[PDB]
Coordinates of all heavy atoms in Angstrom, one line a residue:
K13 N -10.1 18.3 -23.9 CA -11.2 17.5 -24.4 C -11.5 18.0 -25.8 O -11.5 19.2 -26.1 CB -12.5 17.8 -23.6 CG -12.4 17.4 -22.1 CD -12.1 15.9 -22.0 CE -12.5 15.3 -20.7 NZ -12.2 13.8 -20.6
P14 N -11.9 17.2 -26.8 CA -12.1 17.6 -28.2 C -13.2 18.6 -28.3 O -13.1 19.5 -29.1 CB -12.4 16.3 -28.9 CG -12.7 15.2 -27.9 CD -12.0 15.7 -26.6
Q15 N -14.3 18.5 -27.6 CA -15.4 19.4 -27.8 C -15.0 20.8 -27.3 O -15.3 21.8 -28.0 CB -16.7 19.0 -27.0 CG -17.9 20.0 -27.3 CD -18.4 19.9 -28.7 OE1 -18.9 18.8 -29.1 NE2 -18.4 21.0 -29.4
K16 N -14.2 20.9 -26.3 CA -13.7 22.2 -25.7 C -12.7 22.7 -26.7 O -12.7 24.0 -27.0 CB -13.0 22.0 -24.4 CG -14.0 21.5 -23.3 CD -15.2 22.4 -23.1 CE -16.1 21.8 -21.9 NZ -17.3 22.6 -21.8
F17 N -11.9 21.9 -27.4 CA -10.9 22.3 -28.4 C -11.7 22.9 -29.6 O -11.4 24.1 -30.0 CB -10.0 21.2 -28.8 CG -9.1 21.6 -29.9 CD1 -8.0 22.4 -29.7 CD2 -9.4 21.2 -31.2 CE1 -7.3 22.9 -30.8 CE2 -8.6 21.6 -32.3 CZ -7.5 22.4 -32.1
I18 N -12.6 22.2 -30.1 CA -13.5 22.7 -31.3 C -14.2 24.0 -30.9 O -14.2 24.9 -31.7 CB -14.5 21.5 -31.6 CG1 -13.8 20.4 -32.3 CG2 -15.6 22.1 -32.4 CD1 -13.4 20.7 -33.7
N19 N -14.7 24.1 -29.7 CA -15.5 25.3 -29.3 C -14.5 26.5 -29.4 O -14.9 27.5 -30.0 CB -16.1 25.2 -27.9 CG -17.2 24.2 -27.8 OD1 -17.6 23.7 -28.9 ND2 -17.7 24.0 -26.6
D20 N -13.3 26.4 -28.9 CA -12.3 27.5 -28.9 C -11.9 27.8 -30.3 O -11.7 28.9 -30.7 CB -11.2 27.2 -27.9 CG -11.4 27.3 -26.5 OD1 -12.5 27.8 -26.1 OD2 -10.5 26.9 -25.7
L21 N -11.5 26.7 -31.0 CA -10.9 26.9 -32.4 C -11.9 27.5 -33.3 O -11.6 28.5 -34.0 CB -10.5 25.5 -32.9 CG -10.0 25.5 -34.4 CD1 -8.9 26.5 -34.6 CD2 -9.6 24.1 -34.8
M22 N -13.2 27.1 -33.3 CA -14.3 27.7 -34.0 C -14.4 29.2 -33.6 O -14.6 30.0 -34.5 CB -15.7 27.0 -33.8 CG -15.8 25.6 -34.3 SD -15.8 25.5 -36.1 CE -17.6 25.9 -36.5
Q23 N -14.3 29.5 -32.3 CA -14.5 30.9 -31.9 C -13.3 31.7 -32.4 O -13.4 32.9 -32.6 CB -14.6 30.9 -30.4 CG -15.0 32.3 -29.9 CD -15.1 32.3 -28.4 OE1 -16.2 32.2 -27.8 NE2 -13.9 32.4 -27.7
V24 N -12.1 31.1 -32.5 CA -10.9 31.8 -33.1 C -11.2 32.1 -34.6 O -10.9 33.2 -35.1 CB -9.6 31.0 -32.9 CG1 -8.5 31.5 -33.8 CG2 -9.2 31.0 -31.5
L25 N -11.7 31.1 -35.3 CA -11.9 31.2 -36.8 C -13.1 32.1 -37.2 O -13.0 32.7 -38.3 CB -12.0 29.8 -37.4 CG -10.8 28.9 -37.2 CD1 -11.1 27.5 -37.7 CD2 -9.6 29.5 -38.0
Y26 N -14.2 32.0 -36.5 CA -15.5 32.5 -37.0 C -16.1 33.4 -36.0 O -15.9 33.3 -34.8 CB -16.5 31.3 -37.2 CG -15.9 30.3 -38.2 CD1 -15.6 29.0 -37.7 CD2 -15.7 30.6 -39.5 CE1 -15.1 28.0 -38.6 CE2 -15.2 29.6 -40.4 CZ -14.8 28.4 -39.9 OH -14.3 27.5 -40.8
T27 N -17.0 34.3 -36.6 CA -17.9 35.2 -35.7 C -19.0 34.3 -35.2 O -19.4 33.3 -35.8 CB -18.4 36.4 -36.5 OG1 -19.3 35.9 -37.5 CG2 -17.2 37.2 -37.1
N28 N -19.6 34.8 -34.1 CA -20.8 34.3 -33.5 C -21.9 34.3 -34.5 O -22.7 33.4 -34.7 CB -21.1 35.0 -32.1 CG -21.7 34.1 -31.1 OD1 -21.3 33.0 -30.8 ND2 -22.8 34.6 -30.4
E29 N -22.1 35.5 -35.2 CA -23.1 35.6 -36.3 C -22.9 34.6 -37.4 O -23.9 34.1 -37.8 CB -23.1 37.0 -36.9 CG -24.2 37.3 -37.9 CD -25.7 37.2 -37.6 OE1 -26.0 37.2 -36.4 OE2 -26.5 37.2 -38.6
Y30 N -21.7 34.4 -37.9 CA -21.4 33.3 -38.9 C -21.9 32.0 -38.3 O -22.7 31.3 -39.0 CB -19.9 33.3 -39.3 CG -19.6 32.2 -40.2 CD1 -19.7 32.4 -41.6 CD2 -19.4 30.9 -39.8 CE1 -19.4 31.4 -42.5 CE2 -19.1 29.9 -40.7 CZ -19.2 30.2 -42.1 OH -18.9 29.1 -43.0
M31 N -21.5 31.6 -37.1 CA -21.8 30.3 -36.5 C -23.3 30.1 -36.3 O -23.8 29.0 -36.5 CB -21.0 30.1 -35.3 CG -19.5 29.9 -35.6 SD -18.5 29.4 -34.3 CE -18.2 30.9 -33.4
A32 N -24.0 31.2 -35.9 CA -25.4 31.2 -35.7 C -26.2 31.0 -37.0 O -27.3 30.5 -36.8 CB -25.8 32.5 -35.1
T33 N -25.6 31.2 -38.1 CA -26.3 31.3 -39.4 C -25.8 30.2 -40.4 O -26.4 30.3 -41.6 CB -26.3 32.7 -40.0 OG1 -24.9 33.1 -40.2 CG2 -27.0 33.7 -39.1
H34 N -25.0 29.3 -40.0 CA -24.4 28.3 -40.9 C -24.7 26.9 -40.2 O -24.7 26.9 -39.0 CB -22.9 28.5 -41.2 CG -22.7 29.6 -42.1 ND1 -22.8 30.9 -41.7 CD2 -22.5 29.6 -43.5 CE1 -22.7 31.7 -42.8 NE2 -22.4 31.0 -43.9
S35 N -24.8 25.9 -41.0 CA -24.8 24.5 -40.4 C -23.5 23.8 -41.0 O -23.0 24.3 -42.0 CB -26.0 23.7 -40.7 OG -26.2 23.6 -42.1
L36 N -23.2 22.6 -40.5 CA -22.0 21.9 -41.0 C -22.2 21.6 -42.5 O -21.2 21.8 -43.3 CB -21.9 20.6 -40.3 CG -20.7 19.7 -40.7 CD1 -19.4 20.4 -40.2 CD2 -20.8 18.3 -40.1
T37 N -23.4 21.2 -42.9 CA -23.6 20.6 -44.3 C -24.6 21.4 -45.1 O -24.7 21.1 -46.3 CB -24.1 19.1 -44.2 OG1 -25.4 19.1 -43.8 CG2 -23.1 18.3 -43.4
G38 N -25.3 22.4 -44.5 CA -26.3 23.1 -45.3 C -27.6 22.3 -45.5 O -28.5 22.8 -46.2
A39 N -27.8 21.1 -44.9 CA -29.0 20.3 -45.1 C -30.2 21.0 -44.5 O -30.1 21.6 -43.5 CB -28.7 18.9 -44.6
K40 N -31.4 20.7 -45.0 CA -32.6 21.0 -44.4 C -32.9 20.1 -43.2 O -32.9 18.8 -43.5 CB -33.8 21.1 -45.3 CG -35.1 21.6 -44.7 CD -36.2 21.9 -45.7 CE -37.5 22.2 -45.1 NZ -37.7 23.6 -44.5
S41 N -33.3 20.6 -42.1 CA -33.6 19.7 -40.9 C -35.0 19.0 -41.2 O -36.0 19.6 -41.6 CB -33.7 20.5 -39.6 OG -34.1 19.6 -38.6
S42 N -35.0 17.7 -40.8 CA -36.2 16.9 -40.9 C -37.4 17.5 -40.1 O -38.5 17.1 -40.3 CB -35.9 15.5 -40.3 OG -35.4 15.7 -39.0
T43 N -37.0 18.3 -39.0 CA -38.1 18.9 -38.1 C -38.3 20.4 -38.3 O -39.1 20.9 -37.5 CB -37.6 18.5 -36.6 OG1 -36.4 19.1 -36.3 CG2 -37.6 17.0 -36.4
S44 N -37.6 21.0 -39.2 CA -37.8 22.5 -39.5 C -39.0 22.6 -40.3 O -39.1 22.1 -41.5 CB -36.6 23.1 -40.2 OG -36.6 22.6 -41.6
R45 N -40.0 23.4 -39.9 CA -41.2 23.9 -40.7 C -40.8 25.2 -41.4 O -41.5 25.6 -42.4 CB -42.4 24.0 -39.8 CG -43.5 22.9 -40.1 CD -44.3 23.3 -41.3 NE -45.7 22.7 -41.3 CZ -46.0 21.4 -41.5 NH1 -45.0 20.5 -41.8 NH2 -47.2 21.1 -41.5
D46 N -39.8 25.9 -40.9 CA -39.2 27.2 -41.4 C -38.9 27.0 -42.9 O -38.3 25.9 -43.3 CB -38.0 27.6 -40.7 CG -38.3 28.4 -39.4 OD1 -39.5 28.4 -39.0 OD2 -37.3 28.9 -38.8
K47 N -39.2 27.9 -43.8 CA -38.9 28.0 -45.2 C -37.3 28.1 -45.3 O -36.8 27.3 -46.1 CB -39.6 29.1 -45.9 CG -41.1 29.1 -45.7 CD -41.7 27.7 -45.7 CE -43.2 27.6 -45.9 NZ -43.7 26.3 -46.3
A48 N -36.7 29.0 -44.5 CA -35.3 29.3 -44.6 C -34.4 28.2 -44.1 O -34.8 27.6 -43.0 CB -35.0 30.7 -44.0
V49 N -33.3 27.9 -44.8 CA -32.4 26.8 -44.5 C -31.0 27.5 -44.4 O -30.6 28.3 -45.3 CB -32.4 25.7 -45.5 CG1 -31.3 24.7 -45.2 CG2 -33.8 25.1 -45.6
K50 N -30.2 27.2 -43.3 CA -28.9 27.7 -43.1 C -28.0 27.1 -44.2 O -28.0 25.9 -44.5 CB -28.3 27.4 -41.8 CG -29.0 28.0 -40.6 CD -28.5 27.6 -39.3 CE -29.3 28.1 -38.1 NZ -28.8 27.5 -36.9
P51 N -27.1 28.0 -44.8 CA -26.1 27.4 -45.7 C -25.0 26.7 -45.0 O -24.7 26.9 -43.8 CB -25.6 28.7 -46.5 CG -25.9 29.8 -45.5 CD -27.0 29.4 -44.7
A52 N -24.3 25.9 -45.7 CA -23.1 25.0 -45.2 C -21.9 25.9 -44.9 O -21.7 26.9 -45.6 CB -22.8 24.0 -46.2
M53 N -21.1 25.4 -44.0 CA -19.7 25.7 -43.9 C -19.0 25.4 -45.2 O -19.5 24.6 -46.0 CB -19.0 25.0 -42.7 CG -19.6 25.5 -41.4 SD -18.7 24.7 -40.0 CE -17.1 25.3 -40.2
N54 N -17.9 26.1 -45.4 CA -16.9 25.7 -46.5 C -16.3 24.4 -46.2 O -15.7 24.2 -45.1 CB -15.8 26.8 -46.6 CG -14.8 26.5 -47.6 OD1 -14.0 25.5 -47.4 ND2 -14.6 27.3 -48.6
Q55 N -16.4 23.4 -47.1 CA -16.0 22.0 -46.7 C -14.5 21.9 -46.6 O -14.1 21.0 -45.9 CB -16.7 21.0 -47.7 CG -18.2 21.0 -47.6 CD -18.7 20.8 -46.1 OE1 -18.4 19.8 -45.5 NE2 -19.4 21.8 -45.6
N56 N -13.7 22.7 -47.3 CA -12.3 22.7 -47.1 C -11.9 23.2 -45.7 O -11.0 22.6 -45.1 CB -11.6 23.6 -48.2 CG -12.0 23.1 -49.6 OD1 -11.6 22.0 -49.9 ND2 -12.7 23.9 -50.3
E57 N -12.6 24.1 -45.2 CA -12.4 24.6 -43.8 C -12.8 23.5 -42.8 O -12.1 23.2 -41.9 CB -13.2 25.9 -43.5 CG -12.6 27.0 -44.3 CD -13.4 28.3 -44.2 OE1 -14.1 28.5 -43.2 OE2 -13.3 29.1 -45.1

């Protein structure tokens, strides 16, 4: 299944701490009141 493939592949490539602290695009969430915004993944990756 593609979600299971992505979950494994991401776990091969990246740390849990990296994945916990990055978003796909680095966008600010419409619903975040938090000042801090997660930075993007490398778009080539």
Side-chain angles (χ1 to χ4, degrees):
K13 298 298 201 183
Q15 183 69 63
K16 300 301 185 186
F17 173 75
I18 287 285
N19 292 350
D20 282 350
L21 174 55
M22 292 290 281
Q23 192 179 260
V24 166
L25 293 174
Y26 304 115
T27 68
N28 215 45
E29 182 62 13
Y30 179 92
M31 290 192 277
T33 60
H34 286 76
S35 65
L36 183 68
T37 74
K40 187 168 168 81
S41 177
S42 57
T43 59
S44 76
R45 251 280 209 283
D46 282 5
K47 305 322 192 162
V49 177
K50 294 176 185 170
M53 292 180 66
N54 176 294
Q55 296 306 303
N56 301 297
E57 290 174 28

